[PDB]
Amino acid sequence: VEEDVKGKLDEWLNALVHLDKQQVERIYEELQGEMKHVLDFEIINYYKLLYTRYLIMKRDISALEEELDKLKKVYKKYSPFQKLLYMYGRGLLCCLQYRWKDGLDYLLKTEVMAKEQGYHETGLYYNIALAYTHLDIHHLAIHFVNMALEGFRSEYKFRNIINCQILIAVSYTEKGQYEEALKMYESILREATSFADKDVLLAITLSNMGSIYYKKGKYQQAKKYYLDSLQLQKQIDLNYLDTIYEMALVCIKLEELEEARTLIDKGIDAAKQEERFNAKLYLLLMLRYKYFEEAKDYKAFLENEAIPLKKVYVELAEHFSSLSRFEESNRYYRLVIDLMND
């Protein structure tokens, strides 16, 4: 207890921060065999809070959730830094299972805790900005990817810098001009091949770049990008479903509707598998019941008008309801404008 367990966590901490898998896995199992000596609370607690990030990088969500539940009941007493680690942990773990809002609201508290403590985590900036990005066109995302890039360049985190550039790219994309994002993607596509993990970068970039041509026009031009992106899709993730759904949009807007049916079917069959594909499944099942059934149109919304946890579906459900049910629609713009206000 009294001699050098954190006394060598001056060399280990650098490995924990700089993401050096070598030394990390070099002292990981060493720690696993050198942690049955301690009886202290502090020592075990934030080492479990090291275990949570040791597990989130190995992607084991269930054990992360259970460990979260077990670390929650003792979260009250100790400790400030352990509290920071717990809020960061619950934030990231929550961001894993879709739930971006619940992760955000506590990653902001994580932000003010990390700010008050004086400690600096660039990964916090990047992750919170990622949350902002998934929560649509946030300017705090830009602010935080700038705050993260400024440090990344001094930490030589090129692989992270390019990701920041991707976040700025999708920001600019979903915000307006597209062209700047097109140029940034044009530079990334050629500058991603210098990395060892180029496949994921190519996949995501070709995906979003494929999404741009949808808003641009001539969806056939986007079709090839969706094809190349889908050909590079390795495992499973939300962005895959985004790619196939956007491809389905490209199809339904195009003359051909026959393929779109099969693509939608694949989307449904792939989305109803796990938990993180909820909202995507519900938006992929939206147009299916809205534009085919006609008589089952209002029913779907009636079931999930209160389950999106805004503009599009409250505008389209009130586009012809601008001529019918005035009492309902006119007093539903309340939270629509309120969420944009505050």
Binding site: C95, G123, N127, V170, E174, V200, A203, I204, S207, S211
Partner: peptide
Amino acid sequence: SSKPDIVG
């Protein structure tokens, strides 16, 4: 819209 993965 596709996004990069988190840090970890």
